[PDB]
Amino acid sequence: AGVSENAKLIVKKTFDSYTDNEVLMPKADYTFKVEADSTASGKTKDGLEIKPGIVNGLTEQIISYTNTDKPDSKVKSTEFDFSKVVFPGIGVYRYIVSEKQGDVEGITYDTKKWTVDVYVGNKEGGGFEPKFIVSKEQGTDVKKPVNFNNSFATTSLKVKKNVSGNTGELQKEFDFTLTLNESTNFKKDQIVSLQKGNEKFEVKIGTPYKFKLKNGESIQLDKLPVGITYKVNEMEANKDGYKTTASLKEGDGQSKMYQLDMEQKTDESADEIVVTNKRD
């Protein structure tokens, strides 16, 4: 554990808190870098010299995910080949391995780093090569394979109809449309679950979803991706005597006006839209 007997270091990527198949994995890339440990000095238990790692020969490496990946396919890997480095002699060459901070909305990128000790011996026929690679969490003495853990947030949207006024028709059915738009990280034809009462429905990103609400009724999407846009529209707004007003409330914040059919970007605050249809 944490000791590889070749010249390759395996680096894994995980999302420990991603367990719900209904949730969409963001289409995203994770970038890993190997740096010299410039503070490396001294000697090992058997007297071997500890030296800063040589990075010429190494490059940044990427692990990619798509919306098709699910909790069961969430662990991926890349391999850094230290045999591409020219070592000038016997020694322990010490590196630091890390994940770059990306820029995708909703994603938390692992900040932990790993100490990687490459034990270099004589190569048959001349010169030198890695014999063992030892990895540990930086600031620890525990041998452990290199693993970076990311997470991503989901959010929600609820849309409710209230019909008000003296002559508001308390069983009239208002037509609504919900459209989720594609983004860089969430693509067309991916599914998000919508709940109306005790029934579940599938909404496809990029296809307007038609539904109906009477007074008191709502739809909700509990596991919406972060960083997409949506539009909510009510087809008969301000018709048949009705004064229609729509509001948006985010988390425990203050309600503000929501313009029917206007794009709203999803972020880390839960959204609730109330459409009031008043008739005095």
* Distance in Å, CB of 271 to Ca ion, minimum: 5
The response to whether 29 counts as a known ligand-binding position is no
Please list every residue from 148 through 177 that binds Ca ion, using CB under 5 A. none
Q: What is the distance between the alpha carbons of residues 153 and 217, in angstroms, rounded to a whole number? A: 27
* Distance in Å, CB of 253 to Ca ion, minimum: 9
The Cα-based distances of 131 to 5, 6, 35, 211 in angstroms read 6, 6, 20, 64
Which range binds Ca ion by CB under 5 A, 44-52, 54-62, 117-125, 250-258? 250-258
Residue 136: both structure tokens together: 């540990």
* Distance in Å, CB of 177 to Ca ion, minimum: 20
Residue 84 phi, psi dihedral angles, 5° rounding: -75, -10
Which member of 271, 272, 273, 275 binds Ca ion (CB under 5 A)?
Answer: 271
Residue number with CB closer to Ca ion (129 or 267): 267
How many residues make contact with Ca ion (CB under 5 A)?
A: 4
Which member of 250, 274, 276, 279 binds Ca ion (CB under 5 A)?
Answer: 250
Q: What is the distance between the alpha carbons of residues 158 and 160, in angstroms, rounded to a whole number? A: 7
Residue number with CB closer to Ca ion (147 or 266): 266
Which range binds Ca ion by CB under 5 A, 51-59, 98-106, 176-184, 247-255? 247-255
The response to whether 267 counts as a known ligand-binding position is yes
Residue number with CB closer to Ca ion (81 or 267): 267
Sheet of strand 76-81, all strands in order from the earlier edge strand to the far edge: 76-81, 8-14, 146-149
The response to whether 261 counts as a known ligand-binding position is no
Which range binds Ca ion by CB under 5 A, 16-24, 175-183, 222-230, 262-270? 262-270
Which range binds Ca ion by CB under 5 A, 10-18, 43-51, 224-232, 269-277? 269-277
- Cβ contacts of 259 within 8 Å, gap of 6 or more: 246
* Distance in Å, CB of 217 to Ca ion, minimum: 22
* Distance in Å, CB of 106 to Ca ion, minimum: 11
The response to whether 117 counts as a known ligand-binding position is no
Which range binds Ca ion by CB under 5 A, 30-38, 164-172, 207-215, 260-268? 260-268
Neighbours of 279 (CB within 10 A): 16
H/E stretch holding 158 reads strand 154-164
53 φ/ψ sector (left φ>0, alpha ψ -120 to 50, else beta)? beta
The Cα-based distances of 216 to 137, 169, 174, 260 in angstroms read 54, 12, 12, 19
Residue number with CB closer to Ca ion (169 or 267): 267
Q: What is the distance between the alpha carbons of residues 15 and 34, in angstroms, rounded to a whole number? A: 21
Closest-by-Cβ residue to Ca ion is 269
Residue 56: both structure tokens together: 């010429």
DSSP-assigned letters across all residues of 201-232 = EEEETTS-EEEEE-TT-EEEEEEEETT-EEEE
Give binding residues for Ca(2+) as ranges: 250, 267, 269, 271
Which residues participate in the annotated binding site?
Answer: 250, 267, 269, 271
Summarize as ranges the residues that interact with Ca ion (CB under 5 A).
Answer: 250, 267, 269, 271
